[model samples]
Target: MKTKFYDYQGEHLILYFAGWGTPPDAVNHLILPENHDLLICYDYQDLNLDFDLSAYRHIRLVAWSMGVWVAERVLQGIRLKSATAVNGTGLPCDDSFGIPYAIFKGTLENLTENTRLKFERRICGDKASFERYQLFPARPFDEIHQELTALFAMIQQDKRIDLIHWANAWVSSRDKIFTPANQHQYWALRCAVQEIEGEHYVFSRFTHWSALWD
Candidate 1:
């Protein structure tokens, strides 16, 4: 796991567990909460986090895509003010409970610079959102491709936890990566489900991260 800090001198802290292939600038356009600092974690080739979270009196988790599974595994017993999962599941590589196995493998096998743009378009679902995303910086194709290959290998050795800690799961109805049916199935058994009419990368719909909480 790698992290980038978007510092805003504040009391509340947002622990953002980002999805695979997330570039450093993927979330720069998001309107963060007042008096809050954000720490975005991505590049899931490994999952060792050593941050001393006890410093914060208030902590909220916002996880998306493959991050839903990573957060559940990495933050199992840690106390939190609130937690939200968006467009992902604990069984991230499963056929029924997450992204279909074939699609997951195919993405890894064919990932490239051109395909990465196509993938982002699919994640955004509309030209407007895709255009908005293009303004942000993107990771190099080789870096993202390496991550995809590493992630596929990582999931094979990963073990899932039965207990879920997230307060709510946001399912994007139009998500092309992880199907809505799979999201419903996984979240229905764990936490409250909030269906949003958006694509996989859904931060553009809200002004603040706190909106994810109940």
Candidate 2:
């Protein structure tokens, strides 16, 4: 795994667990609130987190896609101010609670330079969103493919530990990667379900990191 830091010299911290294969470009236009620090974590080839979090009095966790699952494992033993899952469940490879098993497997097996663009389009769900996504170069196919394979293996190896209590789970109405129904099914019992209009990548709808839970 990798991380990008936005230091605002604030007491409140937002740990943003980005989607699989995502670059830090996803949060390009967002505002960073005063007295708030942002840390974006991405890639899943490894799950090592070297950052210390003891400094923050209020820690907000906002996770998207596969990062929702990863956050549960990585952020154990720490209390959070709030945790939000955006478009993903901890049982990420499950047929009922997450992306269907066959679809995930096929994505890994059929990944290519051509199909990579297809994945981006599906994630963005719009021409404008896709174009903005292209502003930053996508991660290498082989590297992201390796991360995907690693994520599957890691999820299989680890047992689910319900460490974080999600306060809100936001489901995108038009999400293509993780269907809205599946997202609702997974988060309904765990937290309040909030629906927003967009596709898989909907963080751009908000103006700042603080708005994730608000």
Candidate 3:
């Protein structure tokens, strides 16, 4: 549960959370120090490790993919000025945006050989784009299958959101894993959205990340 700090200036805090199975480096593109304290937590329990949110008046909650689901549960009770999600819908375990329940369960049944490759293709949009995921070899199935199953279970159980509390949110129009349409539908169910253009992982490296805020 220990969080390794990338950019912490002890001022306004911008908390970052990454997707499932992605190391903190997955978000390194978005890690430059702007004008605030930046805290990156790779896991949820790290929230209780060494972060003191009460110390900063202004807080920006940014979560991507699985991070979006994790952030909602962790930051739901904390007072914050903004909460922005990328590529991931608020519901981690819902059928609409997260995944069709049957599909998710069926895929988990084959986590050993082809599931990872299939997942990569699903998020990548096309063959060339999928290389981004292929570059970083996925974790072994034995090490992650149970975790993914538990995550799916947790997602199935979580059903809370107060989207009005967030200042703004970003959704990709070409997302493949979590369809952009589903994101629009899910987010629109709660608040107006600021649409952007990219595949799931390309947004942070593109202009969309900056367009979300100043």
Candidate 4:
């Protein structure tokens, strides 16, 4: 996993695990506390972390899409102030609790430049939001495709996390990627749930990270 640091001189840390193909600018608009340093993690091609995180005394976790599963798998023994899963589940490849296997497989097989734009449009789920996201750069098609292939292979060989670490989950009512029904199935059984009337990218509904509690 590669990390992008938006470090403010602060005591609290917000560790965010972003979805596949997401660029750092996607969440750059979000308002965070002045006392918090934000670290965004992405790119599943390699999950190795070279830096030490022992300096932060207060760490909160927020993960979305395939990130929910990746965060749970990667950050097992670390203590967190709280963890929120949005629009994803720990069983990210499972048909019932996540993206169905066949659809996920098909996406990996057919990913291309045109399909990449289409996928981003699907993520926004509306004209205005879609247009807004167009300003941010998308990852190159080849890189995204390679990451998807690697993640698929890893999920196939890796065991599911036996423990559920998230304290809260946010599911969009009209999410087209992971499917809201499946998100409900997974999160309702495990943690507190918040239903947002939005799409796959639910951050547009909030201006600040603290609004997640609303």
Best by lDDT: 2
Q: Residue 203 deviation, candidate 4, in Å?
A: 0.6
Q: Per-residue lDDT of 141-167 in model 4, one digit per residue for the tens? A: 777888898898988787576454778
Q: Arrange candidates by lDDT, highest first: which order?
A: 2, 4, 1, 3
Model 4 clash tally, residue pairs: 2
Candidate 4: where are CA atoms >4 Å away? 162-164
Which model, 1 or 2, shows the larger TM-score? 2
State, as a TM-score between 0 and 1, how close model 2 is to the true structure. 0.95
Q: Per-prediction count of colliding residue pairs?
A: 0, 1, 1, 2
**10 residues in a row with least lDDT, candidate 4:** 156-165
Q: Give the clashing residue pairs of candidate 2, or none.
A: 1-46
Q: Residues 85-122, candidate 1, lDDT per residue (tens digit)?
A: 88988888999888888988888888778888899999
lDDT of 4 at 43: 86
Against the true structure, candidate 3 has what lDDT?
0.66
Model 2 spans with C-alpha error above 4 angstroms: 159-161
RMSD of each: 1.7, 1.3, 3.0, 1.4
Tens digits of lDDT, candidate 2, 1-214: 7888888898999999988888777876788777888898888788898898999989999999999999998888789999999999988888888888898889888988888889989999999999887887688888888998999788778748566788999999999999998998888888999899999999778887777788
Clashing residue pairs for model 1: none
What is candidate 1's CA lDDT for residue 213?
A: 78
